[PDB]
Design a protein around this ligand. Sequence first.
Ligand SMILES: [Cl-]
Ligand SMILES: [Cl-]
Ligand SMILES: [Cl-]
Ligand SMILES: [Cl-]
Ligand SMILES: [Cl-]
Ligand SMILES: [Cl-]
Ligand SMILES: [Cl-]
Ligand code: NA
Length: 129
Amino acid sequence: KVFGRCELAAAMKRHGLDNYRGYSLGNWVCAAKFESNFNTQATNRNTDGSTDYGILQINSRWWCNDGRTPGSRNLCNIPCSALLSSDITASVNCAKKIVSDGNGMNAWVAWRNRCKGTDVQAWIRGCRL
Ligand SMILES: [Cl-]
Ligand SMILES: [Cl-]
Ligand SMILES: [Cl-]
Ligand SMILES: [Cl-]
Ligand SMILES: [Cl-]
Ligand SMILES: [Cl-]
Ligand SMILES: [Cl-]
Ligand code: NA
């Protein structure tokens, strides 16, 4: 599923992401935009052989099992395929663990490079939340 901007903001808020670990809703929408272009089905291979999955491009190196990332962990305790659903619940629950892991939203490279320090409120502007 390809989410609309406000549609995803609302779903994220409903799943508890708004101000989660101090990160306003716009930060999450911005991260999703640049990670997956709001596409729940997005997958991308990394050079180390891991794969990024879903709306928030969660990495099989640490967070989910895809059975093809040697030596990797599965800290969210889920198959990576569960991160590709039209329902964002699994991605959001895993994201909560990731953003609590120590480096905050810097874990998402696109967030750090494209969202961090910017006017992220613009991502929820106009949205009926
Ligand atoms: Cl957009
Ligand atoms: Cl918020
Ligand atoms: Cl915001
Ligand atoms: Cl594996
Ligand atoms: Cl594990
Ligand atoms: Cl959803
Ligand atoms: Cl933080
Ligand atoms: Na893994």
